[PDB]
Amino acid sequence: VKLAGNSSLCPINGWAVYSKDNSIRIGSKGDVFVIREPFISCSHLECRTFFLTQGALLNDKHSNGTVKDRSPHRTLMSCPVGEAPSPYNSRFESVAWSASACHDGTSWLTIGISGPDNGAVAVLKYNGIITDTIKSWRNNILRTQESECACVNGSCFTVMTDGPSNGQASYKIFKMEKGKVVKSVELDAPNYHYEECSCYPNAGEITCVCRDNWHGSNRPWVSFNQNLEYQIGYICSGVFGDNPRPNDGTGSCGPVSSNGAYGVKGFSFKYGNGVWIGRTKSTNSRSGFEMIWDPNGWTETDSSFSVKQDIVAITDWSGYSGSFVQHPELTGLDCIRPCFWVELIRGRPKESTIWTSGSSISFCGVNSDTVGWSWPDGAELPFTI
Amino acid sequence: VKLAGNSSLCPINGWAVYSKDNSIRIGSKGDVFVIREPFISCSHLECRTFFLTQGALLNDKHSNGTVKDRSPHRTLMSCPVGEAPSPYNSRFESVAWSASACHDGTSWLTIGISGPDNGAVAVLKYNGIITDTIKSWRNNILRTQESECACVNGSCFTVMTDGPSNGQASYKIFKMEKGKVVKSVELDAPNYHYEECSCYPNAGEITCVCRDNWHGSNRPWVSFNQNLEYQIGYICSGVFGDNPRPNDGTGSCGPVSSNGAYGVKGFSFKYGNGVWIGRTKSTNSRSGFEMIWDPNGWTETDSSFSVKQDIVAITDWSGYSGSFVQHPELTGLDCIRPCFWVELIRGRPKESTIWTSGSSISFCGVNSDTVGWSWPDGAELPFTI
Amino acid sequence: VKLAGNSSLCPINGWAVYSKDNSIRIGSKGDVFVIREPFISCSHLECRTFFLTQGALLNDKHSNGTVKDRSPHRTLMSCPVGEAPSPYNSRFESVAWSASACHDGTSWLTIGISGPDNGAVAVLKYNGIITDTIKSWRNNILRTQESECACVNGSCFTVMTDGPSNGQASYKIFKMEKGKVVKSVELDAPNYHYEECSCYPNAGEITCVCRDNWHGSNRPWVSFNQNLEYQIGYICSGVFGDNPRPNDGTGSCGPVSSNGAYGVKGFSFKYGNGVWIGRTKSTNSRSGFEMIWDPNGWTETDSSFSVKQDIVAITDWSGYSGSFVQHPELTGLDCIRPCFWVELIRGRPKESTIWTSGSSISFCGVNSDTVGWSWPDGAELPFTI
Amino acid sequence: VKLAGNSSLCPINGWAVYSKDNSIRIGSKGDVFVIREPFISCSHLECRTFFLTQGALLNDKHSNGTVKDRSPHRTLMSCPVGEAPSPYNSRFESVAWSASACHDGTSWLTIGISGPDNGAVAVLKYNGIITDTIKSWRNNILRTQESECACVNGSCFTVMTDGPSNGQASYKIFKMEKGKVVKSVELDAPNYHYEECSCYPNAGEITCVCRDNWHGSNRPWVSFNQNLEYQIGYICSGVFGDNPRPNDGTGSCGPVSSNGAYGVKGFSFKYGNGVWIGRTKSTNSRSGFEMIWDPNGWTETDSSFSVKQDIVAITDWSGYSGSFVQHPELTGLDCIRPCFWVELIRGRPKESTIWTSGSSISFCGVNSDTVGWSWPDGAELPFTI
Ligand SMILES: CC(=O)N[C@@H]1[C@@H](O)[C@H](O)[C@@H](CO)O[C@@H]1O
Ligand SMILES: CC(=O)N[C@@H]1[C@@H](O)[C@H](O)[C@@H](CO)O[C@@H]1O
Ligand SMILES: CC(=O)N[C@@H]1[C@@H](O)[C@H](O)[C@@H](CO)O[C@@H]1O
Ligand SMILES: CC(=O)N[C@@H]1[C@@H](O)[C@H](O)[C@@H](CO)O[C@@H]1O
Ligand SMILES: [Ca+2]
Ligand SMILES: [Ca+2]
Ligand SMILES: [Ca+2]
Ligand SMILES: [Ca+2]
Known part of the structure; x- marks a missing residue:
């Protein structure tokens, strides 16, 4: 029975830890894949962790990583949430x-x-x-x-980019049914830059918060209905969500140029004019992570928000992060559960090793309260190499 | 279909070996998690061994164990009973x-x-x-x-403690349905100290024999109905159940202070006024383990009992032990099966290694006869380190 | 639906290979259990290999094997047929x-x-x-x-021994239903010796060919109805089935004392007055294996038989062997399939290693024809140790 | 419900990547079988990778491989597609x-x-x-x-050969149901040579494109009905598909002797008078792979074709390749999905190692357009040996 995406995001106050794989700590001896971007996605019965691998295990010579990011060995695989990815x-x-x-x-x-x-x-x-x-x-x-990707009423949507990772590029939204594209639309986004979009369904519509790797410190978004009729813009909050980025000053609803000339995959949940922002704690490195709730901050520009919940100390490495959902057909809830995952990147280019791989951690919405803390990777580098 | 907890503990005469994971022996070469507190819990179809892991495998540097007990890397995981916990x-x-x-x-x-x-x-x-x-x-x-935790008529119950592991702390019993807390009560237990409770259902009510880490060599208990109406006390048997503890002298129904200023998680099964006490054979170390049947020693103070069933020789290490239940819905029986698991701790602080992990063995009630013997961990330490 | 064992053994001309786990070759690097007696058994849906482990992996110091055969670490486990037994x-x-x-x-x-x-x-x-x-x-x-063990009409049977492995011992046949003994009988077998019995169902009754470790070179047998009414004797074929044993001379239906005062678990399939004798090729060592069809040789004494099919060359090590069956409820056949497995023992006491473990191979009945050959263990010894 | 093989091959324009196991790369540290011929086959629910193993793991001494190709340790096993084959x-x-x-x-x-x-x-x-x-x-x-093998209307078919791998051999087509040979026929193919056939169903009949190891550079074929009434021949295209072979000159519908005196397992898909030929890129070695579409080339002799889609660069090792089928019962399509798999062989005899093993990559039919590229094995040889 197809997943209805007609309910709204569950109201929340904080984030409870959902999973931690410790893959890197475990991979130190165990046969664990050296991975990247371990995003979580769920069905009506279970939640799995998808990731990309160079087809090499930690502590092995094939993890050399000097290899092009886009090699022919890169494969997409999945395993149950919280488990270390191994063959x-x-x-x-x-x-x-x-x-x-x-x-x-x-x-x-x-x-x-x-x-x-x-x-x-x-x-x-x-x-x-x-x-x-x-x-x-x-x-x-x-x-x-x-x-x-986001699914609603039996159709799923995704966003692909083609073009330079600097200047203007091309951006399209696709709608598929049973894995078949039934409609696509190119965004008329001059001066925008979309990459690695974190999307999610909400009241039958999708919202994506992405990465501007071209010239923005704030994150760009696209929201569209089931007929690919859309809207675009940027998160106006002065609580810049990309990395790198400048110190939290005054933002705008159009690409903040000051330091946002690169980036990191990330996400944000929209609630009215408010926004839950997930971001690194450092403005220069992919270190630390924290969830910030800036009410009236999706349409306004400030440096003020109400809640800040720690997830990874500035002293530890983090990396990509992304949103995933829980539907009522899995939860029994009457709303959509927003959740997110964080990639804890270890190795190059920040550490003196020959490889690069990431562990994952995840948290979910929740009405009850939580606590901020640090759930870093915890691996002692360098490895036996 | 919800687990009815209306029947009573089956009448027994001894304990039969149910499982042994040989995790540490296996972990010397295999990819086995370094674990602690490997408790067993069953459903209406299978039994699993749950455990906590620092997210490190045996014989790997990450098992360093100098880490704080409560690290952000600790995760609860489970595998089928008798199987070495691996990733x-x-x-x-x-x-x-x-x-x-x-x-x-x-x-x-x-x-x-x-x-x-x-x-x-x-x-x-x-x-x-x-x-x-x-x-x-x-x-x-x-x-x-x-x-x-223990479930009954569609409701599961647990005991939580907050406060010093020395003097008075606070204790609350929780009642949850579909993983939601519908009611909670704080025990008015002045002079009591509860920790790591081993609870079980019995004729629609719950009984927990716990650990008094503050000032008792004997074990405190709590039994409550489905509405959290409770009673509290201490096993009065002169066969003291905690570790450390004094030599079996005269007990009492209120914290025995002589030597009981620390402890180890344990259990006990109540039968009328008697008790089946599981405990370490040593009075100072977590070494050895034996089952003692003190008929009417739950309310009376003696040193005498009638049956002693050896489980682990004083010459071998033991550790935490807990009780677990088999419901008639899993067994077909018309009573509830009392069973227990023992943690065989190896490494620090008693052994010259850099790590600390544990193996598990479990036994179950049974009418037919059994035999005492010794089922130790069996690993040759130290490891390649 | 209970397994009906009313049909008879399917007529057969030879034996076709069914499986080979190569566990020891794989254990050289893989995480394979060091094991003994990997007997096979099937349900109405699949066949599994059961085996006993000391709880150690190959190429690990814990496979030291100087341990007593009956240690508290020996555990019974199973894995799908043909797969290397690993945790x-x-x-x-x-x-x-x-x-x-x-x-x-x-x-x-x-x-x-x-x-x-x-x-x-x-x-x-x-x-x-x-x-x-x-x-x-x-x-x-x-x-x-x-x-x-053998099950018929919803009841399973087994044979246990208690007493010396030398002189007279005590033997009993057990009948259980849903894992509970409902009936048992002690065999009145003065001068007989039963051990490691290989039993199988045939037309509603069980027939077991065992090991006489006291004073017989030929194998003793027991057959009984579903009510434990029985018959006993020895295979009279001059083609002795135990090991050690003397050269095939003239047998008897009562323990051949010449050279058979030790032994090895083996099997045999009775067809009318004939016998499919499975046995080692050597008369002194557990080396090589072969299937021999001596028609009119279960009741008669000779040295002559009509067919010899090779399984393991005299040049390679064998070991325990046992029968297992495949019921029509699994097969679709209108008869019971006779099959057998052979343990390929490597290491001590015949080789200069510090351990002892075995591989397994299995074969099944079959009307079509087969071929004799040699399916040895194939591991290179010694191991890294 | 029995697979109906009455529909025809789906029309296609190219091949989309389906899988890649990276087994060898992963095998550097992980426990991966040293394998050969990892052919893929699907049921009505899943696709699996079957393969032969010497019962040894990469980077272990038992992978010595100087062993005869046909050893008693070789076993046929299978794991899910895209997964590295491990025990x-x-x-x-x-x-x-x-x-x-x-x-x-x-x-x-x-x-x-x-x-x-x-x-x-x-x-x-x-x-x-x-x-x-x-x-x-x-x-x-x-x-x-x-x-x-190919199944149609509840009957599966295979082709076996017995006799020399040089001169004339004997070729038989077997029709079996529920795994029992219900009919067979010896091909009357003087001057033909059949080995390692890649058969597939189409409109209720089976077509097989095999390997002529005796005297052909082009591939021989056999097609038959469910009553084993067959036709035979060689692919006439001057785009020779075997390896070794000559530069694409003029083909013939009869064994192209020149340079065709050895070979490699291969496949081809017939569409009317056209052929989708998969073949290595080199003419002397098993290196590189490409798919070529020569319309009117199954019955004609040319050197010309309209499409070439690279799969493995000439600078990278390839090996055996074969065809596998999707059926409309697993896909939902109204036709049969043609797919193929390529074996990437690493080690001896081309590389300075002690072993030989292969990885796998697979592609499927598809109407949409694809891209030619190079998906090589990617392992760094030699290994720790
Ligand atoms: C530890 C290791 O294998 N590192 C090597 C490094 O020495 C070499 O310079 C480089 C170039 O291919 O490959 C890897 O980085
Ligand atoms: C063998 C080993 O790795 N032990 C080290 C030890 O040398 C060091 O003193 C300690 C402090 O962090 O960490 C680990 O215990
Ligand atoms: C390689 C190895 O560790 N072998 C030891 C051997 O040296 C020792 O004499 C014996 C005593 O238990 O144990 C093992 O056999
Ligand atoms: C690296 C290695 O151990 N190779 C050995 C080689 O030295 C030996 O000559 C050959 C003969 O069996 O066996 C293996 O190939
Ligand atoms: Ca940016
Ligand atoms: Ca105490
Ligand atoms: Ca004997
Ligand atoms: Ca050829």
Whole structure:
């Protein structure tokens, strides 16, 4: 029975820890995959962790990592939430150096992109069998979310980008049914830059908060209905959500240029004019993480917000983060449960090792209260190398 | 279908070996988690061993163990009984440094407590999805059972402690349905001290024999009805159950102070006025283990009992032990099966190693006869380190 | 639906290979249990390999093997047929240094013996839960089949021995239903010696070919109805089946004392007056294996037989062997499939290693034809040690 | 419900990546089987990777490989597609040094050949239980496909060969149901040579594109109906598909002798008079791979074709490749999905190592457009040895 996306986000006060895989600590001896972007996505029965791997295990020579980010060995795989990804427990999803995934209430939809930079192809799979294809339309590194896609009333949506990771690029939203694209639309976003979008359904519509790797310190967003009729803009809060970024000053609803000329995948949940912002604690490195609730901060510009909940000390490494959802058909709740995951990146380029891999941690909405704390990776580098 | 807890503990005469994981022996080479408090809990279909892990494998540097007991890397996980807990056969349960779990006949309820000592929070998960949250009400290490919680007529119950592990602390019994706290009561237990309670259902009510880490060599207990109406006391048997403890002399129904100023998690099963006491054979170390049947020693003070069933020789290490239940809905029986598990702790602080982990063995009630013997851990220390 | 054992053994011409786990070759690097007696047993849906482990992995110091055969670390476990027994793939079954197991059509019945030699206790489990217990009645190493038990019309049977492995011992046949002994009978077998019995159903009755470790080179047997009414004797074929044994001269239906005062677990399939004798190729060592069809040789004394099919070359090591069956309820056949497994023992006492473990291979009945050959263990010794 | 193979091959324009196991790369540290011929086969619910192993793991001395190709340790096993084959995730299928498998909609049929060269026997298993047997009829290495068999209307078909690998051999087509050979036919193919066939169903009939190891650079084919009434020939295209082979010159519908005196397992898909030829890129080595679409080329002789899609660069090792099928019962399509898998061989005889093993990559039909690229094995040799 297809997943209805007609309810709204559950109201929340804080975030309770949901999972921690300690994959890097475990990989020190155990056969664990060296991964990146471990995004979580759920069905009507379970939540799994998808990730991308170079096809190498920690503490092995094949984790050398000097390899191009987009190699032909990069594959999309998944394993149950909270477990360390290893060949002994991970399911194979797709060959990909960029992907996204989601369940529509019936079967899983996975999107893996592979191929050369000048003509990559997104392979759509529905319940493990290829159902469609999408070719780069700008021949300049087709890429997608690196996090969960959003499904509503039996249709799922994703956002792909094609073009330079600097200046203007091309951006399209896709709507698929049973893994088949039934409609796509190019965004008319001059001066915007979308990458690695974290999307989620809310009252039958989708909202995506993404990464402006071109010239913005704030995060850009797109929200659209089931017919790809959309709207775009930026989070106006002076509580800049990208990394790097400048100290929290006055923002704008259009790309803040001051230091936002690069970035990190991230997310944000919208509630009225308010926004739950997930971000690193450092303005220069992917270190630490914290959840900030800036009411009237999605449409306004301030430096003021009401709540700050710590997740990773500034003293420890963090990395990509993304939103994932829990539907009422899984929860029994009468609303959509917002949750998020954080990638704790270890190794290069910040540490003196020959590899790069990340652990994951995740938290969910919740009405009751929580506590801020630090749940870092905890691995002692360097490894036996 | 919900687990009815209306029947009574089956009448027994001894304890038969149920399981032995040989985790440490296996971990010398295998990818086994370094664990603590491996408690067992069953559903209406299977039994699992839950445990807490620092997220490190045996024989790996990350097992350094100098780390604080309550680290953000501690996670609650579970695997099938008798199996060595590895990242390849364990399911992720919750992030926690203290926890409990039980099945109501429908889904698993897990309780993982994590966060800072002055504001730790217990996350409750029904079927893997956060269903409620509990905050430290004393801001001094909210902690729980470290063993199975007890369910009855669709409601599960647990005991939590907050406050000093020395003098008076606070104790609350919680009643939850579908992982949600519907009622809670704070025990008016002046001069009592409760920790790591081992609870079990019996004729529609719950009984917990716990650990008095403040000032008792004997074990305190609490039994309550489904409405949290309770009674409290101490096992009065001169066969003292805690460790450390004095030589078996004359007991009492209120904290025996001679030597009882510390402790170890344990259990005891009440039968009329008698008691089946599980305990270490040594009075100073967590070494050895034996079952003692003191008929009518739950209310009377003696040193005499009638049956002693050896489990682990004084020459071998033991540790935490807890009780776990088999419901008629799993057994087909017309009574509830009292069973117990013993943690065989190896390493620090008693052994010259850099780590500390434990193996498990479990036994079950039974009418037919048994035999005493010694089922120690069996690992040759130290390891490759 | 209970397994009906009313059909007879399927007629056969030879034996086709069914499986080979290569556990020892794989154990060189993999995490394989060091094991003994990997007997096979099937349900109405699958076949599993059961085995006993000291709880150590190959190539690990804990596989030291100088330990007493019956240690408190020996555990009964199973994994799918053909797979290497590892803690990552094996299911825990019971704590035991001696055991048997069989499925009745509904659930598995496992029997594990543990405890001291002067009072070992067999714990019977049905679907993982203890359903009965049997104590030693001679207080001298209670032991059982070390292979599959036989179930018929919803009742399972097994044979246990208690007493010396030299002279006269005591033997009993047990009948259980849902893991509970409903009837037992002590065999009045003066001058007989039964050990490690290989039993199987045939037309509603059980026939067991065992090991006479006291004073017989030929194998003794017992057959009984569902009410434990029995018959006993020895295979009279001059083609002696035990090991050690003398060269095939003239047998008798009463213990051949020439060279058979020790032994090895083996099996045999009776067809009318004929016999399919499985046995080692050497008369002094557990080396090589072969299947021999001596028609009119279960009741007669000769040296002549009509067929010899090679399984393991005299040049390679063999060991325990046992029968297992495949019921029509699993097969679709209108008869019971006779099959057998062979333990390929490597290490001590015949090799200069510090351990002892075995691989397994199995074969099944079959109308079509087969071929003789050699399916040896294949591991290179010694190991890294 | 039995797989109906009455529909035809789906029309296609290119091939989309389906999987990549990275087994060898992962095998540097992880416990991965050293394998060969990892052919893929699907049921009505999942797709699996079958493969032959010497019962050894990468980077372990037992991978020494100087062992005969046909050893008694070789076993046919299978794990899920895209997963590295390890003893922790692979299912045992059969003892075999030559094999094939396919699902008929109800259960899996596996065929594993074992035994000596002068009398090998093929064991057929339907749902894991032996259902038939086939003896060598020429006593000269009875061998089979090493890829998926084809099922249609409840009957599966395979092609086996017995006799020399040089001159004339004997070729037989077997029709089996529920794993029992209901009919067979020896091909009357003078001057033909069939080995390692890649068969597939289409409109109720089977077509196989095999390997001529005797005297052909082009591939021989056989197509038959469900009554084993067949036709034979060679692909006439001057785009020679075998390896070794000559530069694409002029083909013939009869063995192209020149340079065609050896070979490699391969496949091809026929569409009218056209062919989708998969082949290595090199003409002397098993390196590189590409898919070529030569319309009107199955019946014609040319050097011209319209499409070439790279899969593996000439600078990277390839190996065996074969075809596997999707059926409309697993896909929901109204046609049969043609797919293929390529074996990436690393080690001997081309590389300075002691072992030989292969990784796998797979692609499927697809109407949408794809991209040619290079998805090589990616391991860094030599290994720790
Ligand atoms: C520890 C290790 O293997 N590091 C090597 C490094 O020495 C070498 O310079 C580099 C270039 O290929 O590859 C890896 O980084
Ligand atoms: C063998 C080993 O790795 N032990 C180290 C030890 O040398 C060091 O003093 C301690 C302090 O962090 O950490 C670990 O215990
Ligand atoms: C390689 C190894 O550790 N072998 C030891 C051996 O040296 C020692 O004499 C014996 C005593 O228990 O134990 C093991 O056999
Ligand atoms: C690295 C290694 O151990 N290789 C050995 C090689 O030295 C030996 O000559 C050969 C003969 O069996 O076996 C293995 O290939
Ligand atoms: Ca930016
Ligand atoms: Ca105490
Ligand atoms: Ca004997
Ligand atoms: Ca050729």
